């Protein structure tokens, strides 16, 4: 949604629609001592607000990044 | 999907696992049923190929653990 | 000059930076000056490629630290 970026919102006020794809990237601060994986899961509109396990969390389209990784993580 | 921390993890880990094959040979699918079964039904091409977590997704390896110890048993 | 410990560093810190390109366009140099200024005084070339240590040239991070304090503020 537009309310994900400032810029944006404010645009918003403006105009009555909006159709698009962001991106998103996420980026995290780890040494190379450390150790540990995240998962980024992409939940489709109507779905619902139910809570989930990893491994379910895995049967969505997903990114599982190492918390090493420097790059940041692009996620369309 | 997958993404080892390869990049930042150093050398200290293997990446692949070596090992010799599966003393083993290949078995056939589909292709037996296909004469007698009533239908033969087809799955979702999405479910083909997504390695999603098992519902006996999870095990855990301690000090505590003994070789021999089962960490899981899996039935086709 | 400079000689970065990659070859004894392992690979348990990252060498280069990998990071999105500045969101701004390249800004031209004495060009606009050449008709109205009194001169133009060239600079030895010997110090137009040699990187020295800035006299604000150092900065301290710790655990101390909170993120959004300031390390240093340049300005050109």
Partial sequence: ?76 | SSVDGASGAGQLVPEVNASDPLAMDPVAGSSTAVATAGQVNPIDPWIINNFVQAPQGEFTISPNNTPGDVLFDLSL
């Fill in chain 1, 1 to 76: 949604g537009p309310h994900l970026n400032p810029f944006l919102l404010h645009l918003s006020q403006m105009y009555n629609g909006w159709v698009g794809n962001m991106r998103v990237r996420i980026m995290l601060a780890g040494n190379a001592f450390t150790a540990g994986k995240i998962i980024v899961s992409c939940i489709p509109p109507g779905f619902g607000s139910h809570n989930l396990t990893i491994a379910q969390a895995t049967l969505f389209p997903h990114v599982i990044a190492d918390v090493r990784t420097l790059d940041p993580i692009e996620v369309p």
